[model samples]
Target: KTKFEKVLLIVNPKAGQGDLHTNLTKIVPPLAAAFPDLHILHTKEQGDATKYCQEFASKVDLIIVFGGDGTVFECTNGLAPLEIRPTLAIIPGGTCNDFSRTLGVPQNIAEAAKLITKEHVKPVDVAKANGQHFLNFWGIGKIGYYLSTIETFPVKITYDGQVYEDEAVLVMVGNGEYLGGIPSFIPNVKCDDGTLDIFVVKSTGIQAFKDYIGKKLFEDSNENDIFHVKAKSIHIETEEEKEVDTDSSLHTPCQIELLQGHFTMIYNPAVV
Candidate 1:
């Protein structure tokens, strides 16, 4: 048996085409047998995971987050206030699954579950926006605009399967891996590092949008024109009414600054 006394599994039922809930039956029993002291908890609604995680921080030795990156973001916020933070095991179940890809968790769910049983742990860096902490990127301008359109757009598109038409002024910041589902777009991105990778899309109009796509999709060094920068801290605010998405959750437009290395997470060295 593992030396760790207890594990808390925080799951978001609605994540990843709802597989987080649907697949739980297949994963839970085997996991319990593997880790006898495991305890399972599910988020009832938006922000519930964070609330539950904060409550569980002091009580558990480890936390296994079973959702997408956004769910992991919530759990991090919940646990950020605790004096002693537990190690996190991320199980991917979201559209982007960018963070898990960065961590090298196997895409195969069964394989990932098995890997989680291993005792390997690494220190990963996290950032703070305003008073809240995030395990991934933050952004404004074009990135924020794109996120806003995607959320408000009537049609839902699969991020990995296909690229849809979306034109909005947006900015995106990422800590883990790929941005906008493109791998090489942010080639220098790192997750456990003490800085934030910020990308701003300044293009507007149909022709400009096409040019931007060509740059991001085909052109090398195209990320340079996108106003890419690394900062230990940043402040963001919208001049007009605009929607903001942090890890995909909609938030009112407000000022947020990045505080680097504010929290620690479990990293997989092989991937980093």
Candidate 2:
């Protein structure tokens, strides 16, 4: 039942460290050969992908995105509220490409283009922190502080009503497998898993923060006293105003809520 006629392709002109134009020359032709009614647009500004997906998602059957994670993050927010969301595919066009990496989308552009023609679609969850929707992971606490500046803050988080309040280094709630570019930090992360993976770390300073991230990178499980929680939803409230982000879009978040089964993606299907 996976039939598609019209396609709307979103390209981020500035992604892939300026090699995207060269990549596009290779990517579009195979997709064009497979589908007759393909249309394309290059994003000129921030939020362009989100804006495009909101306006045109229902009209097209497929949406192929060639951008970095922010572009895909916007697309997730844009499509999540739609009555009929278009199916999505990704050809990684950014540095992190975190969401695409999590979905098992090939980093090689030609393979991704070919894979799009095959019918292998799966449902995915997009988390909403306050009103913002993001795909991959939502980060808070000292992790948020570390990414922005050296300002650490305290917060209380309730995961399915289980509570943790501390002067935290950070917390990471992941839906996608890749968190900060390492794919195996969580042993059981899947896009459509119906549950969220949570990580909470206590704050020390920049040196300890580096060690904390490095520990998770090498260890499959959260070592060095990181708290792991599993939940269908999460609630967080800041003791003071602090930053929260899943990508480049910044928000001084006071709350976060996880939304499950928000959209579908046409990716390299995982062996079940």
Candidate 3:
């Protein structure tokens, strides 16, 4: 008997700037051979993955997604409203592939396909921002540090019953450790820990920001200018509506809550 009765392969043709086609020739055959009942769907547009997954996920036992962060985000939204979700397998074919990197899935699509045969599964946490569920970090303010002038704003943040109001430069609630392919953002990130790491920065100085990220290069701690906490529930209200970057972009004021071990994901056991 097969482990999964039915499997769906969701592919984003435009992922990695449409560089996925030649690689597909390498990955698809191995996956198709491993899962005999697999069906493939190539996404046509932005929300196509979500639509396809929503329609087919309940009927399948597994979902193997081949795309970037946005494609995975769409599948997450598709599966979020269901009472039962199929196990998820990710093949990283994105620019950053943040969450997939955190799961230790190989960036090489051909190598990623081999893990499907191994069938290593782990229960992972998912975070919700208002109505949508996310697989990685959610943030307000500037995520990139390349700007000459850092824009600052006032915000009230409440996490796990503790409230603090400050003029903030950035507030990041991270579920996955890596951001933009770097593990330096939330160094202590644990996806199965039933909690999320909240990083709040108050200083406008670029040197201070560097020092803070550099500090995390060694370990995690609280700072006078930056506040770090681990919590299950977080509420953020900015003075003005700022863009919320939840791997994908949304706007805030938003309520973020952690769903502990909410989804089963296939990961590379060798990476850990």
Candidate 4:
């Protein structure tokens, strides 16, 4: 038996079309039977999950998150400062589950829960930004502007539980596989590899954006010499005062430097 003494289930009720709570009821029974010592916690407001994780980091052996990529993002910030970080399990219940897709977890909540019940653990890479940690990518400039715009758009139109529809420009520093549902060209990209993949986009017009998407999605090419830097540490700065989206939350940082190799997460061996 995998020796997990205690497991924390941090859930975001409003995530994924506001149906996360409904989905959890379907999976928790099976999970409770499999791991009787599990503890349940619901995030009552924004950033609460991370705070809870930070408060309880030393008390738990594993932490399982059920929401979208944003929820995982919050938890990462909460857990990154700990001397001993708990193993992570992800269940996709949020819109734009980019992280879970990178991990190859199914969109179905029950299937994801079953996979977690198997207790497979893998050490995944975590990126840092100005003393903060992230498992996914970060960026500045036009991409940052796009992310900011998308946040104000309605969740139903942009994301409805399991689907996403948006045409915003995106630049990312990805640690795993996909970004905004598209796979990147970096062949050696691995979740546990202790590095970050940086991609930037600078197109503006709709037709130009379409062409850019085609190049990135099919041609495996980059335009305007869009820089791709592979590094264990990176710095981001914008010419104009701007905001940034880490995972999915928005923040403004004039200068930020990140370091890698900060945490452990369960990886699907079949995908890695």
Candidate 5:
């Protein structure tokens, strides 16, 4: 009785740095030897991972994904709609493998590949914004914008029956603590906690911006530039149509909700 009866492997050729083919040539042999029933698929385009996962998620007992965050993102969307989702295993192969790092899966491909063969598995939560599933976060305003915009606009946020109506600069609702390879959230934010961490930047100025960049705003709340909350659901509305970035996003008047322990995943047991 093997742990995984059947498995599907999805690899994105274009993900990560250096020669991916060279790396796979060395590591795949170990995986193939460990999981005799494994079937492999290489993704050609952006949505191919999602499409493949959507089609075969139920058929396989485990689906191992080897790619970047976008590939993981695509697969999450595919898995979120399913009534019974196959266990997900990720092998980090891209820049800022955010969720993978959060799971404390080793960044080294060799280590991550072997970790999957072990019987370490964990249940993880997946969030939704406007009906789209996301494994990381949803952001609007300056949080998602790369350029400096001297724009502060009126926005309304409702969560846990609490209302925050103010002119704001950014909003981040997420499960993972790391963003763009750095610890971007308050301490003790866990992926399986069943509550989303919400951070809203209320003011726009040099000092305020400095504090945010320094991660000072992630600390305990004060009546100041940043507002933090944790809830199962949130409602966000903007005066003008704002583009929401979830590292995945949609237009404003968005609904953010949580699905607790929605997906079973392979995680490092050594990681807290």
Candidate 6:
């Protein structure tokens, strides 16, 4: 429903094996035609998307993202800080593209760009962890378990003031679904729901991850093994400092909350 003549196209040159870099000009003719006033910019470093958005986001009516979830995270962090933000869109170009899948973007790069011209604008909720904005799901889980040494640890969690002390193997918080490239890992999570969903698997000593994976995946398990809650704000007060992963990037979060209807995003409304 929203349209823009002036567009800022932010792309990562090294992303997706640089396929977009080589084939961008030929892949989607409709995309270039739709925005005659498009100004394309490339990301040269790790955090350039945010930098680009911060420097030039307000000058355009729409900002198009052309990288993976990490790039999108940077873009979100950049745009979230602005009072006057432009409509955001994505042309999926990365290894996982998990957030793009949550938005129902096409896997094929060319088609995703074509969709840019034919889509509706919707307000999306962005989650904050340790003050950084993440568009997709976030949590402490096994995606990086191999990268970091982790074990089931004792922690106290409060979801919208509902507090409980428990040991957790993993704690997943979702504003947008599809974490670790898996669909519905935190089932029923909606990006625009104005609330965050938490999935916590209680630790059972040595059998913590084992029990949750074998028993919980197919069907319901003992009430003590798992907990799922929805709230406006969730806090984790471990006896010690803890690391959290959002959109596959890790950081320590002191406070986590949902920013209700944070900003406008353009996407294929027909996708569900």
Off by over 4 Å in 4: 16-22, 142-172, 184-189, 202-224, 236-241, 248-260
In candidate 5, what are the lDDT values of residues 1-272, reduced to their tens digit?
Answer: 55888999999987657687787875587789898799999999889999999888879999989998888888888898999799999888887788888788888888888988885888899898889888887887723235234377888989988888887777778788667765554444668999998777776443554445426233564447667778887998989898877755488998888999999888898874
What are the per-residue Cα lDDT tens digits for candidate 6 across 78-112? 89978988889887776677778778887777778
User: What does candidate 1's lDDT look like per residue over 164-228, in tens digits?
Assistant: 23333555666766544334244466766666665554443323334544133433244333445
Clashing pairs in 5: none
151: Cα error in model 2, Å: 6.7
Sorted on TM-score, highest at the top, how do the candidates line up? 5, 3, 6, 2, 4, 1
- Candidate 2 C-alpha lDDT tens digits along 106-221: 77877878888785888888777667776777776422234435455676778887887776676777777765555535546677878877776666544544544423353334
Off by over 4 Å in 1: 1-3, 14-22, 142-170, 180-184, 203-224, 236-243, 248-270
| C-alpha lDDT of residue 167 in model 3 | 82
| lDDT of every model, 2 decimals | 0.60, 0.73, 0.79, 0.63, 0.79, 0.73
What TM-score does model 4 achieve against the real structure? Answer: 0.75
Cand. 1 Cα-lDDT: 0.60
Give the winner by TM-score: 1 or 4.
4
The worst-scoring run of ten residues by lDDT in candidate 6 lies at: 211-220
Where's the lowest-lDDT run of ten residues in candidate 5? 142-151
Give the TM-score (vs. native) of candidate 1: 0.71
User: Using alpha carbons, what is the TM-score of model 6?
Assistant: 0.86
**Per-residue alpha-carbon lDDT of candidate 4 for residues 1-272, written as tens digits (9 for 90 to 100):** 65678888887777655465578776687778887699999999988988889877999888989887778878888887788788888888765677787777767888888878877776566766655566666654322235334411111111112322222244456675655555534444556665565554434333344444412343334444343445554444333345565664444332233444456665566655
Please list the Cα RMSD from the true structure of every candidate, rounded to 1 decimal place.
8.2, 3.6, 2.6, 8.8, 2.5, 3.5
